[PDB]
Amino acid sequence: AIVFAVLIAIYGVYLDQKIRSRIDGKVWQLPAAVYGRMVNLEPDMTISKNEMVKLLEATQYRQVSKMTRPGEFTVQANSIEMIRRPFDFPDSKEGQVRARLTFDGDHLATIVNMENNRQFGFFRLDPRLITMISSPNGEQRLFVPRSGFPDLLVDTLLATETQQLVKNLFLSKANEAYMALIMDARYSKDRILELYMNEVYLGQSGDNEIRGFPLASLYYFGRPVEELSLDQQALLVGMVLALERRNLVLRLLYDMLSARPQPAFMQLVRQELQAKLGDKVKDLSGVKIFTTFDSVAQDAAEKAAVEGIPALKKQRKLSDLETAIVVVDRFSGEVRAMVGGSEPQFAGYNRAMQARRSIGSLAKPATYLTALSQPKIYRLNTWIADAPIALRQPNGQVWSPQNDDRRYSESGRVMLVDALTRSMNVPTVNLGMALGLPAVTETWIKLGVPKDQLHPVPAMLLGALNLTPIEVAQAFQTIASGGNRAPLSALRSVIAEDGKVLYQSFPQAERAVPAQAAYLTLWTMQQVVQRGTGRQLGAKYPNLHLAGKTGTTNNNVDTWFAGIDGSTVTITWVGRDNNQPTKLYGASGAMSIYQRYLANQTPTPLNLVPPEDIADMGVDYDGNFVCSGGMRILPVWTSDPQSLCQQSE
Numbered sequence: 088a089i090v091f092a093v094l095i096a097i098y099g100v101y102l103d104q105k106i107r108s109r110i111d112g113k114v115w116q117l118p119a120a121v122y123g124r125m126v127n128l129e130p131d132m133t134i135s136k137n138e139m140v141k142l143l144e145a146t147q148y149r150q151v152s153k154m155t156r157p158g159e160f161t162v163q164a165n166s167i168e169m170i171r172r173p174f175d176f177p178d179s180k181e182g183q184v185r186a187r188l189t190f191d192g193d194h195l196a197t198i199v200n201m202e203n204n205r206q207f208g209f210f211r212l213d214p215r216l217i218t219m220i221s222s223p224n225g226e227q228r229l230f231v232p233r234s235g236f237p238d239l240l241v242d243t244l245l246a247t248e249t250q251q252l253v254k255n256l257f258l259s260k261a262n263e264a265y266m267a268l269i270m271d272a273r274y275s276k277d278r279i280l281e282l283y284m285n286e287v288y289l290g291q292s293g294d295n296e297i298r299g300f301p302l303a304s305l306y307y308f309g310r311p312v313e314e315l316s317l318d319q320q321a322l323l324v325g326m327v328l329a330l331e332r333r334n335l336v337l338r339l340l341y342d343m344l345s346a347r348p349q350p351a352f353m354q355l356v357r358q359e360l361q362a363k364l365g366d367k368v369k370d371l372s373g374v375k376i377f378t379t380f381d382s383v384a385q386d387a388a389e390k391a392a393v394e395g396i397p398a399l400k401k402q403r404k405l406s407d408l409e410t411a412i413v414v415v416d417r418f419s420g421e422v423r424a425m426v427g428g429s430e431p432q433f434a435g436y437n438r439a440m441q442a443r444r445s446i447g448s449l450a451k452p453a454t455y456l457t458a459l460s461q462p463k464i465y466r467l468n469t470w471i472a473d474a475p476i477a478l479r480q481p482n483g484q485v486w487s488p489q490n491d492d493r494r495y496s497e498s499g500r501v502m503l504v505d506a507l508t509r510s511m512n513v514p515t516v517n518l519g520m521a522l523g524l525p526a527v528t529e530t531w532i533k534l535g536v537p538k539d540q541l542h543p544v545p546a547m548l549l550g551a552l553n554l555t556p557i558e559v560a561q562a563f564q565t566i567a568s569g570g571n572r573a574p575l576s577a578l579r580s581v582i583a584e585d586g587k588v589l590y591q592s593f594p595q596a597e598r599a600v601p602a603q604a605a606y607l608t609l610w611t612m613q614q615v616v617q618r619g620t621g622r623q624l625g626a627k628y629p630n631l632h633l634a635g636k637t638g639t640t641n642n643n644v645d646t647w648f649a650g651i652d653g654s655t656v657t658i659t660w661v662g663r664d665n666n667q668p669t670k671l672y673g674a675s676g677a678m679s680i681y682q683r684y685l686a687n688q689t690p691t692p693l694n695l696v697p698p699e700d701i702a703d704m705g706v707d708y709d710g711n712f713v714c715s716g717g718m719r720i721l722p723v724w725t726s727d728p729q730s731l732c733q734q735s736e
């Protein structure tokens with residue numbers, strides 16, 4: 088019965104149909120790749136040699152003595168030499184660039200291409216791959232075409248071992264062998280290994296399969312497939328006793344070689360992807376997600392949390408203590424770092440987005456910002472009464488707020504500037520009540536805090552406002568930018584596999600409060616750090632000229648710190664998940680975590696550029712403006728400083 092060779096031949100044509108429907112189109116449901124911030128280096132930019140090495144190491148760059156592969160760098164007395172690895176940037180796709188970065192003190196002078204010895208207007212740094220968004224299959228892959236793999240890695244694989252391809256692609260011996268002779272005849276020998284190098288099982292991440300050479304190289308070493316050393320190339324081929332198999336591959340093909348994710352930040356990323364695009368993203372294959380994430384700021388914030396919390400737990404003899412750190416861009420609102428606990432590597436509860444706590448004294452700048460927005464009535468030299476308060480509540484209660492020392496000024500008065508500097512409760516209520524709670528509540532709305540959290544009662548002025556550190560970061564960013572509310576974002580762009588722009592971020596800053604009131608509040612916040620509540624930071628970092636504010640709720644249940652540098656707004660919270668005493672203050676708790684965060688990186692000094700109609704004016708001991716001289720110089724929102732003439736008469 089020669090009929091058999093006809094029904095098996097028609098099965099081969101109906102197998103060639105199946106190897107077409109798959110390979111001609113969607114081969115895999117490639118998970119979405121999440122990338123960090125794309126840093127553009129530029130001549131005259133304020134970055135040091137040490138700051139650049141740290142930035143490089145954080146972006147998966149390895150320090151060497153002589154460069155041979157991309158993603159490597161060398162350190163010299165006043166320069167850095169690097170082979171910037173190829174990256175498919177959304178703006179323009181680039182390749183290998185051998186560049187030299189020459190420094191002059193705290194700033195970069197030149198970025199010169201070592202191939203033609205020419206200067207760069209700006210030089211692009213590739214972003215670090217943070218994580219992959221969980222695939223529906225559970226099979227995690229990162230697609231790279233044939234060419235992307237080095238010739239040595241290909242040869243380490245050929246041999247040991249088309250036959251395997253079909254097994255992992257369509258099967259649960261004769262069936263695959265028939266498919267193998269259908270495959271090899273239809274597609275080129277090089278196309279065959281392209282699919283093989285992106286199919287093979289190489290690892291396990293919980294209950295998510297880590298398959299293919301490009302994702303395995305990063306999942307095991309933290310460096311791309313192109314930049315794999317022969318010993319590492321052998322191990323990746325060998326996995327297709329652990330040290331023994333690496334050496335087993337080495338002997339097959341010597342003695343030297345044989346001797347040799349962000350759960351807090353991703354919550355915001357996944358939440359923003361859902362809000363901006365919807366359910367349309369998840370279906371699409373091989374999506375590229377570009378975030379605002381800073382590897383340098385994060386590693387520094389994690390280190391400050393992992394080291395600071397147990398150091399505070401041993402000093403105050405605490406059984407349990409927790410923290411939350413949110414770093415956002417001063418001007419754009421871009422979220423650079425997010426810490427939701429003392430264990431930022433191993434987490435389920437994100438304190439930076441879920442721990443809704445009383446803000447305390449962090450509510451004070453809203454009151455002074457509302458006051459300073461009215462320059463014809465409220466200035467820095469404005470006298471505020473500091474005497475016993477008794478306010479009527481419905482029905483029979485009397486609210487008598489006190490300053491922390493339960494004391495009042497001998498004169499019964501303080502200047503607005505000192506009241507915020509020292510975080511004095513009594514004059515803050517007096518000022519807040521004279522302006523009225525609806526005026527102070529309106530400032531908060533403009534600062535971008537949630538509307539449903541604002542209850543306009545006298546207690547609001549002192550800190551009866553429950554917010555998460557991210558909502559506090561939004562409020563402080565608005566004051567820090569110079570009075571522009573830039574809605575906080577984790578997403579820069581969302582790009583399809585075919586290079587199609589699905590989502591693109593654009594600036595949407597809104598003028599919330601006047602620039603002058605925001606400056607006057609910021610300059611006053613520099614006084615808290617230098618001479619007021621945050622004085623311990625100001626003594627450690629006097630040249631940074633930080634603008635800050637401490638927070639210490641009633642019964643030491645919460646310690647807050649709102650730190651502002653030249654480039655970032657950092658909100659720190661230190662407290663207990665059981666809402667209990669921490670034996671800590673704003674300065675000793677949250678601020679101690681911020682210093683460590685400042686020491687763990689290189690911060691940008693805050694040089695307040697005064698906006699329009701700002702004049703430095705002299706006041707006498709009585710607080711009255713004087714023409715020439717005065718024992719105190721205060722900046723004033725005025726277009727004609729001859730407020731002095733009117734005052735002197």
Ligand SMILES: *C(=O)[C@@H](NC(=O)Cc1cccs1)[C@H]1N=C(C(=O)O)C(=C)CS1
Pocket residue numbers: 447448449489490491509510512549550620637638639640641642643672673674
């Ligand atoms: C605001 O936080 C303000 N707190 C209170 O008045 C309630 C108190 C809590 C502990 C003692 S009184 C306080 N501001 C600071 C600060 O950290 O800036 C505190 C030192 C106490 S007054």
